[PDB]
């Protein structure tokens with residue numbers, strides 16, 4: 001309705017803190033702005049839990065269009081995908097559709113020297129995502145595909161250790177989803193301690209670690225750990241969501257740490273944006 005135009009625009013203005021815009025062009029412009037401030041980008045097309053196999057494959061094709069556009073602009077493709085957006089769990093001609101679309105995405109990013117992260121979704125998808133991650137590392141190399149472990153899950157430390165033979169690039173996060181006490185630590189102090197164990201164990205193992213958090217107490221303790229263990233500032237990076245603690249993003253880059261910002265865009269922004277709102281301090 002014409003009467004609702006102002007409210008629709010106001011909601012989008014709220015979301016624009018967290019979402020670059022709705023187009024590939026808006027996302028590329030936002031990454032160029034980050035790079036001018038010494039910060040790297042990690043592109044994501046928004047959307048998840050896509051029901052139709054056709055739409056899952058269209059979504060993968062749109063991620064490929066993004067990778068082509070980034071490359072043509074002189075940006076090394078670094079893209080995060082949710083496998084539920086590209087068909088994970090659905091069979092097409094005897095193979096998992098998420099796996100076959102992820103192969104196409106990673107092959108394209110790798111042609112251009114790029115990288116794909118498999119985001120971690122809710123706990124029901126962890127086993128299949130870790131199985132598919134191991135398969136994809138075998139096909140494309142640990143330099144070209146990474147994944148995520150969530151510190152709120154009891155299983156995560158064991159999962160991290162199980163992956164060490166792959167020398168994998170892993171992003172450590174607290175965890176974005178609603179999870180019961182049989183699956184996830186209810187006490188935030190345990191989530192935060194387990195976060196440190198994941199980062200510290202990954203660094204000691206010599207694997208590339210993405211320290212994805214806006215929690216300054218944790219960030220300061222990671223700086224301390226890296227100093228005490230003689231770890232180079234080329235061996236890991238901090239990561240933050242677009243729009244959150246921009247001051248820290250800039251400060252860390254000025255101190256010579258690597259910083260890479262998760263940079264989402266697209267028309268289907270409601271789910272991601274709703275999680276940002278629910279997280280408000």
Ligand SMILES: Cc1cc2nc3c(=O)[nH]c(=O)nc-3n(C[C@H](O)[C@H](O)[C@H](O)COP(=O)(O)OP(=O)(O)OC[C@H]3O[C@@H](n4cnc5c(N)ncnc54)[C@H](O)[C@@H]3O)c2cc1C
Pocket residue numbers: 118119120121148150171173174175176177212213214215216239240241244261262275276277279280281
């Ligand atoms: C780059 C990146 C990628 C991620 N990828 C995944 C993934 O694939 N799967 C997954 O389950 N989780 C993922 N996460 C984690 C999930 O998004 C977090 O649980 C959430 O970001 C919690 O924020 P936090 O670690 O800053 O800490 P918190 O303890 O939640 O917050 C720490 C402080 O950060 C600031 N802050 C954090 N969030 C907000 C906000 N929404 N609004 C305003 N201030 C805020 C506040 O100052 C807050 O007190 C990712 C997080 C990051 C940073």
Ligand SMILES: O=C(O)[C@@H]1CCCO1
Pocket residue numbers: 119176262272275
């Ligand atoms: O989708 C989300 O809310 C989180 C943050 C980025 C990747 O997974």
